[PDB]
Every structure is written in C-alpha cells, then in structure tokens.
Amino acid sequence: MPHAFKPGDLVFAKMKGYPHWPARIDDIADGAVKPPPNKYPIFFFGTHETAFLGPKDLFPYDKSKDKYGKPNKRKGFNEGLWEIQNNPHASYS
Ligand SMILES: OCc1cccc(NCc2cncc(Br)c2)c1
C-alpha cells in the first residue's frame, strides 16, 4: 500500500516543457524555505536542481520507469537516469 511521499522516495517528476524527469523527494533543512501546502522539495537528478511540486506531478519510480526511463537528448537527463538507477540517495551538492 502506498503512503504519502517522504524524503528518499524516488519518482519521475513532471514540469511543463520537460519530459518526466528522474527525481527524489528531498528533506527540508532547518530554517530553509518550506514548500507551499501539499508540495514537496523535488531534487532532479542529473541537473541537480530543486523545485516545489505537488503529488499530481510525481510518479513513483518503480511503477513508471518502463514508460519514462528512456534516454533522450535533454541536458542532464541521461545522467539523471544513471543517478536514480545507480546511487539515488547520494550527496550531489
Ligand atoms: O519552474 C521552476 C523550475 C525549477 C527547477 C528547474 C527548472 N527548469 C530546469 C530543469 C532542471 N531539471 C529538471 C527539470 Br524537469 C527542469 C524550473
């Protein structure tokens, strides 16, 4: 049974103008800006950028990897695929 997203969960995250992108739910550091209601800090693998997104844009990784895991030409995407498959919980900062 699924649960609400928690830090460490692996997803594909969708933003307008980009393919569904390999990403993880991040933690919020002490005193850092918190997401709006029902949004989460999304760390994008490959590009190593963070956005606040809601669950409607978050696709759990295992269920969605067959559909969204194909390499493409977008900058950072293939490295993102490598990171989520090979070391998704490492420090990339
Ligand atoms: O719209 C706010 C916002 C926040 C972070 C990054 C971007 N664009 C670039 C980008 C980088 N990695 C994955 C994707 Br998917 C997109 C936009």
From Swiss-Prot:
Domain PWWP: 7-64
Tissue expression as described in the entry: Widely expressed. High expression is found in heart, skeletal muscle, ovary and testis. Overexpression is frequently observed in hepatocellular carcinoma samples.
Localization: Nucleus; Cytoplasm
Family: Belongs to the HDGF family.
Function in brief: Acts as an epigenetic regulator of myogenesis in cooperation with DPF3a (isoform 2 of DPF3/BAF45C). Associates with the BAF complex via its interaction with DPF3a and HDGFL2-DPF3a activate myogenic genes by increasing chromatin accessibility through recruitment of SMARCA4/BRG1/BAF190A (ATPase subunit of the BAF complex) to myogenic gene promoters. Promotes the repair of DNA double-strand breaks (DSBs) through the homologous recombination pathway by facilitating the recruitment of the DNA endonuclease RBBP8 to the DSBs.
Subunit structure: Interacts with HDGF. Interacts with trimethylated 'Lys-36' of histone H3 (H3K36me3). Interacts with trimethylated 'Lys-79' of histone H3 (H3K79me3), but has higher affinity for H3K36me3. Interacts with IWS1. Interacts with H2AX, POGZ, RBBP8 and CBX1. Interacts with histones H3K9me3, H3K27me3 and H3K36me2. Interacts with DPF3a (isoform 2 of DPF3/BAF45C). Interacts with SMARCA4/BRG1/BAF190A, SMARCC1/BAF155 and SMARCD1/BAF60A in a DPF3a-dependent manner.
Protein name as catalogued: Hepatoma-derived growth factor-related protein 2
